[PDB]
Design an enzyme around this catalytic site. Structure first.
Site, PDB file in Angstrom:
ATOM      1  N   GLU A 156       0.830  -1.193   0.000  1.00 15.66           N
ATOM      2  CA  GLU A 156       0.000   0.000   0.000  1.00 15.66           C
ATOM      3  C   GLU A 156       0.871   1.251   0.000  1.00 15.66           C
ATOM      4  O   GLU A 156       0.554   2.212  -0.671  1.00 15.66           O
ATOM      5  CB  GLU A 156      -0.917   0.022   1.232  1.00 15.66           C
ATOM      6  CG  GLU A 156      -1.991   1.118   1.207  1.00 15.66           C
ATOM      7  CD  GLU A 156      -1.694   2.308   2.104  1.00 15.66           C
ATOM      8  OE1 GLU A 156      -0.585   2.404   2.675  1.00 15.66           O
ATOM      9  OE2 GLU A 156      -2.611   3.163   2.257  1.00 15.66           O
ATOM     10  N   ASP A 211      -8.542   1.344   7.783  1.00 16.26           N
ATOM     11  CA  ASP A 211      -7.188   1.900   7.768  1.00 16.26           C
ATOM     12  C   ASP A 211      -6.995   2.957   8.856  1.00 16.26           C
ATOM     13  O   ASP A 211      -7.931   3.698   9.178  1.00 16.26           O
ATOM     14  CB  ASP A 211      -6.871   2.498   6.397  1.00 16.26           C
TER      15      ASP A 211
HETATM   16 ZN   LIG Z   1       0.728   4.768   5.914  1.00 14.61          ZN
END
Ligand SMILES: [Zn+2]
Length: 326
Positions: A156, A211
């Site tokens: 990511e 997240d």
């Molecule tokens: Zn990060």
């Protein structure tokens, strides 16, 4: 437009059960979490160990686990990446997909744990699979054409300055892979009447991406009009948990208000983007603003707020229960 699946409110009995925690539940979650509170930079041994732990944990629960591995060019040269996809019932047409990333940022200043980003989300997904196991295995036998799928994205983070080419390596790869993987309703188990299925990406009924979770007092908003019916269930569940007195607060007579009933004007880039671009409905469970510790060496274990983590775990457990009618 209505959500393609009628969303039956969780019975009170189930809400209360999903809203309880034994100290052994807390202990189980913390044990799981300790496995992720290590640096896990792309290419590293600890990174491989974390992937192995995710894979083994889920295989041990009799989930189907795919390790989607590939090499990609980065500003730091060729790098190996491996997404982990766990699917409770591979043959079920539609997937409720919960996701996060398991790599940690290679921080220019030194060792970076990425406790909220996203070690806690990783642990939350495993904890959901473990704690709901009996109910999930029961649900899998229904033949109702719906299942749970957990995706742990690799890569990511950017290696250098975040860009379209340097970030989201695992999610860009997987979204394209599934988009190009052709299939149809006849090959699958119990698709909904009005379903247009042309490829694997169409089977993702909604992707709920967690997240930057673990800091005190996160503020969430509905980032996508398309999934407002789903988002509103998180709002309602949180409200019912507070009404029941099942949330941990600093003082009596307070309520959590994590899931705001507003929408915001905010553009966030994350693992959802390559799927959003391919018409996957997204719920992005990410705080706005980001935690103060974001991309600092202080994004570590001691800066986690455990009462918040417990409260979120209750919301998530109740949400999965409600969506899958566990
Ligand atoms: Zn990060």
């Amino acid at each position: 437009l209505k959500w393609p699946r009628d969303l039956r409110p969780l019975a009170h009995h189930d809400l209360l059960y999903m809203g309880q925690i034994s100290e052994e539940d807390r202990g189980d979650f913390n044990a799981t979490l300790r496995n992720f509170l290590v640096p896990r930079v792309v290419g590293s041994q600890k990174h491989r160990e974390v992937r192995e732990f995710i894979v083994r944990s889920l295989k041990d629960l009799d989930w189907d686990v795919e390790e989607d591995c590939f090499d990609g060019q980065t500003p730091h040269g060729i790098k190996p990446f491996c997404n982990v996809i766990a699917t409770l019932n591979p043959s079920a047409c539609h997937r409720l997909v919960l996701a996060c990333h398991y790599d940690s940022l290679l921080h220019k200043e030194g060792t970076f744990i990425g406790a909220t980003d996203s070690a806690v989300p990783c642990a939350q997904l495993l904890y959901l699979a473990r704690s709901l196991n009996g109910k999930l295995q029961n649900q899998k036998t229904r033949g109702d054409g719906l299942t749970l799928q957990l995706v742990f994205f690799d890569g990511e983070e950017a290696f250098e300055r975040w860009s379209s080419h340097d970030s989201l390596y695992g999610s860009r790869h997987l979204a394209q892979k599934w988009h190009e993987d052709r299939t149809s309703a006849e090959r699958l188990e119990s698709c909904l009447e009005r379903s247009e299925i042309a490829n694997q990406i169409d089977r993702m009924e909604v992707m709920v991406l967690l997240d930057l979770l673990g800091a005190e007092n996160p503020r969430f908003y509905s980032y996508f009009g398309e999934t407002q019916p789903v988002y509103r269930r998180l709002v309602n569940i949180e409200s019912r948990l507070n009404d029941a007195g099942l949330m941990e607060l600093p003082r009596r007579r307070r309520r959590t208000n994590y899931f705001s009933n507003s929408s915001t004007v905010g553009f966030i880039e994350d693992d959802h983007i390559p799927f959003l671009k391919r018409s996957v409905p997204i719920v992005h469970i990410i705080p706005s603003p980001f935690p103060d510790v974001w991309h600092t060496l202080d994004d570590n274990e001691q800066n986690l707020h455990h009462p918040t983590i417990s409260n979120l775990n209750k919301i998530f457990k109740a949400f999965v229960s409600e969506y899958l009618q566990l």
